[PDB]
Structures are given as structure tokens and as C-alpha cells.
Design a protein around this ligand. Structure first.
Ligand SMILES: N[C@H](CCC(=O)N[C@@H](CS)C(=O)NCC(=O)O)C(=O)O
Ligand SMILES: N[C@H](CCC(=O)N[C@@H](CS)C(=O)NCC(=O)O)C(=O)O
Ligand SMILES: C=C(CC)C(=O)c1ccc(OCC(=O)O)c(Cl)c1Cl
Ligand SMILES: C=C(CC)C(=O)c1ccc(OCC(=O)O)c(Cl)c1Cl
Ligand SMILES: [Ca+2]
Ligand SMILES: [Ca+2]
Ligand SMILES: [Ca+2]
Ligand SMILES: [Ca+2]
Ligand SMILES: [Ca+2]
Ligand SMILES: [Ca+2]
Lengths: 209, 208
């Protein structure tokens, strides 16, 4: 630290890493880039891959949301207990990212025509995370092992936005349903989720959710 | 004991295979045909309903980048530092973003999409040139001064783009030299010349 998040005024791809920092007792600065500022070109041109989020951790500049998650997971001890658990954490996170990518494509490119199909396919996309919970301490702790990992924050965000897209999608998945409530109730995470810094942002950039 | 379970293509296993070969490792290839896959049994038993599946002794993994990170962690190909680890991830995530765009082209829009993709390509390659320029004059690796899992994934990405668009690396001296230097590593050189690499198509649908 100090931590600085540089992003558009939305939850989007920074929602998980923000929940992670809040839950871990960390403070950070939000640096807001408007559409107008972005279209000016300067920051985009100076960004490694022409994209946000950009993340500062002291003198380290990072890009890529999952790089930020893994960095915080590594530096804050949210990466499982050994090498084998680290691999399971990665596997869960990569799974979350695949669904996030599908979600974003819907939101951005094909919301109106694609929503029906997306919602029909949703149970089958959510089931693996239910299966993973069932295989770990009866779904009663975390997605991997007996300590929170960066993959938990990412999965939690994914589930939250899908309950918004498709209210009741978690009703068929008792472990995932209970997991959302249990993690959301963690006192520091509970505070953050109720705060204006979370509540007063839209989920995505285009008005859709 | 390593086992790769995948379709008979290079695809998302090309990088982890180069990694295992260059690190002096043996592994078994278990081939899943289109006909077997369509039968449904392996797809249903797979975590996310997809390949590759990777066995490492008693450990079963899915997700190509999970496999890369696992091998990188277990074989010491993940930087010297927590900070270098983060830079390795950043490069790999960048490689994955372009790989995802490449696959979308190949699979969904090759004929109509290629012209636009090729025009956009220099701007998509430029960041990896810039990273090389900031690390020991581009003379070693993408991050630090030891090979990482990100190197194998980036090398694969570059090799397939030269097939898609011959001469795309000509404007990028560091990326061009990097492809030759890594490809010349003796164990990797042998693998890249071997039937198990050469006799596979890059993708599943006949396009490249
Ligand atoms: N690989 C992604 C890339 C993030 C991304 O798609 N950035 C978007 C906003 S979430 C963006 O900067 N778009 C603006 C542009 O490309 O000009 C990540 O995990 O960070
Ligand atoms: N997130 C990807 C998923 C791999 C993937 O897209 N698998 C394809 C072939 S490379 C597949 O199994 N498709 C068959 C299907 O979906 O039924 C990874 O990194 O492994
Ligand atoms: C997170 C996103 C929505 C799902 C997203 O990708 C995105 C892209 C461009 C954006 O504006 C910059 C611009 O003028 O394009 C904004 Cl605000 C967002 Cl949120
Ligand atoms: C990215 C890919 C590999 C380069 C890919 O999308 C893919 C998907 C399905 C496939 O067959 C299974 C089927 O019958 O669809 C195959 Cl062989 C491939 Cl290579
Ligand atoms: Ca703050
Ligand atoms: Ca601020
Ligand atoms: Ca811990
Ligand atoms: Ca019900
Ligand atoms: Ca074989
Ligand atoms: Ca090493």
C-alpha cells in the first residue's frame, strides 16, 4: 500500500477486489475515470493493454482485474494453505472469469435478444460452484479449504450480479444460496456492501443489469 | 505423473505442453475425439463441461491457465518474488485476452472478421514488445531473468499469430528475436520439431 483503484464509475470488474480489500480491513483510494476523460485518449494510451482497471500498490502499477485479485491474494494470504489448494483456488477463479466474460458479452453486446437463452443456460453454468461447495466441508466454509481466498470474493460478486440479472437463480442451489448470505454477513464486508461507495455505483456502464 | 486429456489439436494445451517439454518432463496424451465428446460421458463428468483436463498424480485439474499456474508454481516458473509473480500474472492475463479474441475469430467469424482482426493486431502485440523493452533490453524473458509459465503462453500466442498473419512480428524486433531465442532452447526445439507437435492442427475447425 497505499492502494489506489483507477476505474470507470461502476462496480464491474473492480467489485470483487474492492470486497476483498474491505473485508481484509484495508483502505484504498478510488480514482474515477469518466467516459469523457477516457475518450480523450491519454490514459488509454498510457495503459499497458489500453484498458482499466489500473491498480497502484505503493510503487507497483498493475493492470488486469485477475492479476490484482491474485496479487492481493498472494500478499494478504488468501491463496490457500499449500500449492495444491492454490491450484484449486486458481481453478475456481478461472471458472468465475469464464462466466463473467459470458455475462459481460450479454450485457454489452446482446442483452435484449440474448437474455432468454442466457438465463436458460444459467443453472448449468452455476452448478459447478455448487458441486465444489458440496465437496468442501459440506459447503459450510469457503469455496476452497477452510480459509477465505480471492476466489471467494470473485465468486461472491458473480453470484450477486446473477441474482440481479435473474432473481431466484440461486434458489435451486442451497449451498450457493447460504454461501451468499454467510459471506455477505461478514461484518466488514457487510458494512462495505451497505455503504454509498458500493450502493451508489451501477453494476455495469450501459444502464443494464 | 502427468496426463493431458484434450482434443487432437494444439489449441489451449500448446503452451503447457511446450512448458513440460522444455522443463524435461514426460507426460501422457489422452485423446478425446469429436465423436467421443458428443457421446456425453466425459463432458458430464468434467467440472466446467470442457477440456483440457489435466492429471498430476492424484490431482485432477481443469482450466488451461490453472494448469499453467500449477506447473509454474510446482516447477519454479513464477518469478523470483511476489512482485515478479504479479508481473507474470499480468503478462499471462494479457496473453489470455488476445487468445480469447483469436479463438472468437477462428471459431465464429474467420472469413468476415479476419481483415479487421489483422488491422487491429499491431496494437494488440505492441504491449508485449513494450514489456520486453523494459526488461533487460528484451534479451532474456518476458518477466525477470528466468523463464516463467507466461513465456510459454506468450510464445505460443506469437507462433499462431505468425501463422494467421505472416510477418506480423516484423515491426517488433524484440518479439521477433524472442520467438527465435525461445524456439532454439534445445528441449523446446526438439519438441517443436517432433511429430506430437507437428502432426496436430492448431485449432479444431481447419482454420489458422
Ligand atoms: N482483461 C480484463 C480487461 C478489462 C476491460 O475489459 N476493461 C474495460 C472496462 S471493464 C475497458 O477498459 N474498456 C475501455 C476500452 O477498451 O477502451 C481485466 O480483467 O481487467
Ligand atoms: N477456460 C478455458 C476453457 C477451455 C475450452 O474453451 N474448451 C473447449 C475446447 S478448447 C471445449 O472443451 N469445448 C467443448 C464444449 O464446450 O463442449 C480453458 O482455459 O481451459
Ligand atoms: C464494465 C463494463 C460494462 C460491462 C465495460 O466494459 C465498460 C467499457 C467502457 C466504458 O466506458 C468507456 C467508453 O467510452 O467506452 C465503461 Cl464506463 C464500462 Cl463500465
Ligand atoms: C478453442 C478450441 C480449440 C482450439 C475449441 O473451441 C474446440 C471446441 C470443440 C471441439 O470439439 C468438440 C465438439 O464436437 O464441438 C474442438 Cl476439437 C475444439 Cl479444438
Ligand atoms: Ca476510500
Ligand atoms: Ca476518490
Ligand atoms: Ca489466510
Ligand atoms: Ca425453486
Ligand atoms: Ca496417448
Ligand atoms: Ca526458475
Amino acid at each position: 500500500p497505499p492502494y489506489t483503484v483507477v476505474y470507470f464509475p461502476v462496480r464491474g470488474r473492480c467489485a470483487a477486489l474492492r470486497m476483498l480489500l474491505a473485508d481484509q480491513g484495508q483502505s484504498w483510494k478510488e480514482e474515477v475515470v469518466t467516459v469523457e476523460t477516457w475518450q480523450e485518449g491519454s490514459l488509454k494510451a498510457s495503459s499497458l493493454y489500453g484498458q482499466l482497471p489500473k491498480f497502484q500498490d505503493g510503487d507497483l502499477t498493475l493492470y488486469q482485474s485477475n492479476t490484482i485479485l491474485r496479487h492481493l491474494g498472494r500478499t494478504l494470504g488468501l491463496y490457500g494453505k499449500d500449492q495444491q489448494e492454490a491450484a484449486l483456488v486458481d481453478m475456481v477463479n478461472d471458472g468465475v472469469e469464464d462466466l463473467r466474460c459470458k455475462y459481460i458479452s450479454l450485457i454489452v453486446t446482446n442483452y435484449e435478444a440474448g437474455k432468454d437463452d442466457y438465463v436458460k443456460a444459467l443453472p448449468g453454468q452455476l452448478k459447478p460452484f455448487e458441486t465444489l461447495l458440496s465437496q468442501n466441508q459440506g459447503g459450510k466454509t469457503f469455496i476452497v479449504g477452510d480459509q477465505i481466498s480471492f476466489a471467494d470474493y470473485n465468486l461472491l460478486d458473480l453470484l450477486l450480479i446473477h441474482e440481479v440479472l435473474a432473481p431466484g437463480c440461486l434458489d435451486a442451489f442451497p449451498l450457493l444460496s447460504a454461501y451468499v448470505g454467510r459471506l455477505s454477513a461478514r461484518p466488514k464486508l457487510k458494512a462495505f456492501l451497505a455503504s454509498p461507495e458500493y450502493v451508489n455505483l451501477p453494476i455495469n456502464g450501459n444502464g443494464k443489469q
